[PDB]
Amino acid sequence: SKEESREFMAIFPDIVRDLTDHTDIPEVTKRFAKVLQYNVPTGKKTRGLSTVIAYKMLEKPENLTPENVRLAGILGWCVELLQASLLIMDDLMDRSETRRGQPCWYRQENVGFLAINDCLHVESSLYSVLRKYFSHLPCYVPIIELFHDVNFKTNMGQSLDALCMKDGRPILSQFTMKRYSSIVKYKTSYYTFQLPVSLGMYLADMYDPEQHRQAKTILMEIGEFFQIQNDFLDAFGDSTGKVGTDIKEGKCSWLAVVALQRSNPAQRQIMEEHYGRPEPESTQIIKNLYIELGLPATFAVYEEESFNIIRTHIHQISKGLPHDLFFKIMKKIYKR
Amino acid sequence: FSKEESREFMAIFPDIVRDLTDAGRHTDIPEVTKRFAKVLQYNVPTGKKTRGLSTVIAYKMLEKPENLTPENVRLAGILGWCVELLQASLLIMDDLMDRFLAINDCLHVESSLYSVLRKYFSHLPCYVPIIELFHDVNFKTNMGQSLDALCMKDGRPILSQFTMKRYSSIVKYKTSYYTFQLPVSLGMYLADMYDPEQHRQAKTILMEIGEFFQIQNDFLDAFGDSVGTDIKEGKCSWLAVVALQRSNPAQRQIMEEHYGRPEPESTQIIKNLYIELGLPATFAVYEEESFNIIRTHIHQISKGLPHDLFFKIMKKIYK
Ligand SMILES: CC(C)=CCC/C(Br)=C/COP(=O)(O)OP(=O)(O)O
Ligand SMILES: [Mg+2]
Ligand SMILES: [Mg+2]
Ligand SMILES: [Mg+2]
Ligand SMILES: [Mg+2]
Ligand SMILES: [Mg+2]
């Protein structure tokens, strides 16, 4: 919706003012405004907007006031602040050139490893936003605890991802489907899928842990498909205006994991020799192996089977959770 | 810090590691959880733990003697370890900018203190004041780190930025809030002391003590008996700030040419300039005058706050 998008985007400048406008240190508050402006509001705010839509589908219709929808928007921006902090740090760790076509924050003049402090600063800032707008509401402490717990879990995911590499070289013995599933769950699914929905639930005063658990079961399955589709399109997508670098980066990708499952010893040796190498010819060799191993056909089967399995699980959801929310998430990911 | 206080405090650490690395819960990610145990063990419990123990001593000197149970003194110890988790995250961030530590270990160790707070304090009246204090001190400490960084550009110190106003702000935000205010305000909250005027009264004195602590530290970096790298690193130190205040144009030119250079000869040139500028005598005057002002302010402490706590902190720094 155009109206939902514009109402959401209009909140961002107020949050920057809340975090910057400490009158004894104006130079560093002006700098922090630039950190937020560069890293937080550009490109798609899918997670932030999903927080608002989750709330709108969980709350009683008569309680959906402009005031409460704006509170859902502020929680959405707190998700975007967490994500901005994570991506500032990840770009430094991976020594990436760009994100969404923008030069990475750490590459800007006189940032570099100061990006680590900026990461911690941006993550810390969301709790000041929560205090300003939520400190008098019953959802305050549950929402604080959710953000701190998702941060902790996301760090476990990032560190597990790092345990698949040694001295900038992929450890292919670590590239198992069990490890892949765990990386996706902790590194991406918690902050991308669980956090927006659990925030919507708390703002709607839904505190039943069993409701959050039932939601989690579905959201982790959808999150797994989301990342697998993302991994698939990195190699096999139409260059969306993005050029995929997962192979060059030596990522523990669904493609790399399934390639190792399906590979004979000779095919395994091609992965060992060429995976995670900077040479364009090495990326071409890996892509050619993925084609040879029939990974496109394997993804097509997984895409249809996973859709049916998740649809079945959503029909089985109970304890008064709305099915339409989970069907709508399923539709926007699978695009059907 | 007494033998009993120190030993009881240090005995809590292994429980905090078990709490954070899912001991009792049967985790689906045991290899990264085992790694996080090693991150905590290798970086958090080593050295003196002054901030952690200061949290326990603050609580013991603020609480009613009747309420000082083993259980409550242990809770003060857990709050002290949350301060030491913050300290460890800041030291890791320092080590990462210097050089098995991963970049996200500083974020992860910082985040872990909030898991400890939730575990032990979520059902107590002091919970929200304590988490809001950590949120605020976290944000202010990051502001302080960035203010320090604004004194350097393209690997060179920006000496025009080296003002006493900027120096005082760096020390307050980067160091004094988490080192001095945080332990005492935590002790006060655990003792159910919520009065904003009491917290403000403590803050005035603790920011003054924090400033002396850092100025003494800066002085000893150049003039202590060993090795200090503040000059080589181009740090906005009290010595550099006062050197610029006291320098004639020729002396300023020596700072401009030799401050923040890697050559050992350039460090010796700056130390020789500090000597001819009378920074030792200037420090001696500052130390006596600051001691007298802080002693006066502690004697004047009101709002029902105990003097002995602030005198114990003061005497620990001034020796
Ligand atoms: C704790 C912490 C800093 C987590 C980062 C989480 C995320 Br989301 C990292 C991004 O994942 P990845 O580097 O695999 O892909 P890309 O950079 O989007 O191409
Ligand atoms: Mg990356
Ligand atoms: Mg990464
Ligand atoms: Mg991708
Ligand atoms: Mg990328
Ligand atoms: Mg020093």
Side-chain angles (χ1 to χ4, degrees), chain B residues 202-248:
Chain B
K203 177 146 74 167
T204 308
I205 282 42
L206 292 168
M207 295 303 97
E208 290 181 341
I209 295 176
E211 188 167 274
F212 173 73
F213 164 73
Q214 188 59 63
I215 292 172
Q216 180 178 240
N217 180 274
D218 288 353
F219 177 73
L220 288 171
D221 201 79
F223 288 102
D225 199 346
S226 74
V227 293
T229 60
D230 284 356
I231 294 159
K232 178 176 173 176
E233 292 192 53
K235 293 218 166 180
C236 186
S237 81
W238 182 87
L239 288 176
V241 170
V242 175
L244 294 168
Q245 291 183 345
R246 294 174 70 82
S247 284
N248 69 20

Side-chain angles (χ1 to χ4, degrees), chain A residues 24 140 145 148 179 186, chain B residues 28 31 127 132 135 154 173:
Chain A
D24 64 333
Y140 186 45
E145 290 180 346
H148 285 305
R179 185 160 292 98
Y186 285 94
Chain B
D28 56 344
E31 98 189 276
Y127 188 46
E132 287 184 349
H135 293 158
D154 308 328
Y173 283 97

Side-chain angles (χ1 to χ4, degrees), chain A residues 19 22-29 31-32 85-86 89 92-93 95 110 113-125 127-128 131 135 140-141 144-149 151-160 162-163 174 179 182 185-186, chain B residues 20-21 27-29 31-33 35-36 89-90 93 96-97 99 102-108 110-112 114-115 118 122 127-128 131-136 138-147 149-150 152-155 161 165-166 169 172-173:
Chain A
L19 292 175
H22 304 113
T23 60
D24 64 333
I25 51 170
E27 197 180 350
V28 75
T29 69
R31 182 179 178 282
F32 191 55
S85 72
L86 297 174
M89 181 162 275
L92 176 62
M93 287 177 66
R95 300 300 201 274
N110 284 289
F113 270 71
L114 294 172
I116 298 170
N117 185 64
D118 289 336
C119 160
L120 268 63
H121 199 172
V122 172
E123 194 272 347
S124 183
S125 78
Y127 302 94
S128 297
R131 182 171 169 178
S135 71
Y140 186 45
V141 169
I144 289 168
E145 290 180 346
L146 175 63
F147 269 104
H148 285 305
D149 190 64
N151 191 34
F152 186 97
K153 282 171 159 64
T154 305
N155 273 280
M156 283 296 187
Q158 183 74 336
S159 292
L160 183 58
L163 282 172
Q174 292 284 86
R179 185 160 292 98
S182 291
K185 174 179 166 181
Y186 285 94
Chain B
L20 287 173
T21 58
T27 185
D28 56 344
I29 50 162
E31 98 189 276
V32 68
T33 300
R35 179 180 178 278
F36 192 57
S89 73
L90 293 170
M93 181 169 69
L96 288 164
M97 286 159 182
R99 291 275 196 182
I103 286 165
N104 68 296
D105 284 335
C106 60
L107 181 61
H108 200 174
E110 184 235 279
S111 190
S112 79
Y114 294 100
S115 290
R118 176 181 180 173
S122 66
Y127 188 46
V128 171
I131 67 184
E132 287 184 349
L133 173 64
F134 268 102
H135 293 158
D136 189 56
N138 217 310
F139 185 92
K140 284 172 155 61
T141 307
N142 294 134
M143 304 197 89
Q145 289 278 346
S146 289
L147 183 56
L150 281 167
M152 287 258 303
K153 183 166 185 284
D154 308 328
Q161 295 282 96
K165 179 177 153 62
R166 187 154 294 96
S169 291
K172 176 207 287 206
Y173 283 97

Side-chain angles (χ1 to χ4, degrees), chain B residues 9 23 183 229 309:
Chain B
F9 177 75
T229 60
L309 172 54

Side-chain angles (χ1 to χ4, degrees), chain A residues 165-176:
Chain A
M165 292 256 295
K166 170 170 183 62
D167 305 340
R169 286 188 164 188
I171 312 167
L172 295 189
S173 58
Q174 292 284 86
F175 283 39
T176 71

Side-chain angles (χ1 to χ4, degrees), chain B residues 125-290:
Chain B
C126 57
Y127 188 46
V128 171
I130 287 174
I131 67 184
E132 287 184 349
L133 173 64
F134 268 102
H135 293 158
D136 189 56
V137 168
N138 217 310
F139 185 92
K140 284 172 155 61
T141 307
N142 294 134
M143 304 197 89
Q145 289 278 346
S146 289
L147 183 56
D148 199 28
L150 281 167
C151 296
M152 287 258 303
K153 183 166 185 284
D154 308 328
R156 293 292 299 145
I158 317 159
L159 294 183
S160 59
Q161 295 282 96
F162 284 41
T163 69
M164 192 59 76
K165 179 177 153 62
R166 187 154 294 96
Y167 176 77
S168 288
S169 291
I170 291 165
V171 174
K172 176 207 287 206
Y173 283 97
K174 195 179 82 166
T175 307
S176 295
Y177 263 111
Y178 94 90
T179 299
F180 291 99
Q181 188 65 39
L182 177 57
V184 173
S185 278
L186 287 173
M188 287 174 69
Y189 286 145
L190 188 59
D192 289 316
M193 296 169 70
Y194 300 105
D195 176 11
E197 284 193 349
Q198 285 182 326
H199 286 263
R200 186 254 294 106
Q201 168 73 98
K203 177 146 74 167
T204 308
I205 282 42
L206 292 168
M207 295 303 97
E208 290 181 341
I209 295 176
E211 188 167 274
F212 173 73
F213 164 73
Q214 188 59 63
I215 292 172
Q216 180 178 240
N217 180 274
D218 288 353
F219 177 73
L220 288 171
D221 201 79
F223 288 102
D225 199 346
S226 74
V227 293
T229 60
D230 284 356
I231 294 159
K232 178 176 173 176
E233 292 192 53
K235 293 218 166 180
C236 186
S237 81
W238 182 87
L239 288 176
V241 170
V242 175
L244 294 168
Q245 291 183 345
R246 294 174 70 82
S247 284
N248 69 20
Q251 290 168 319
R252 172 57 166 264
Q253 186 275 330
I254 296 171
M255 284 294 282
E256 292 284 357
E257 183 165 2
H258 290 287
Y259 201 70
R261 304 290 189 176
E263 294 90 351
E265 316 92 84
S266 285
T267 286
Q268 283 310 297
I269 286 166
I270 296 302
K271 179 162 183 171
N272 290 333
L273 179 64
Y274 287 176
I275 282 164
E276 94 177 33
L277 287 172
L279 297 200
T282 304
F283 176 72
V285 168
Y286 165 75
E287 187 170 51
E288 200 77 285
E289 287 186 349
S290 69

Side-chain angles (χ1 to χ4, degrees), chain A residues 90-91 93-94 99 158 161 187 251:
Chain A
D90 177 81
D91 284 337
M93 287 177 66
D94 296 337
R99 182 174 295 280
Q158 183 74 336
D161 202 24
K187 195 189 76 180
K251 285 198 189 156

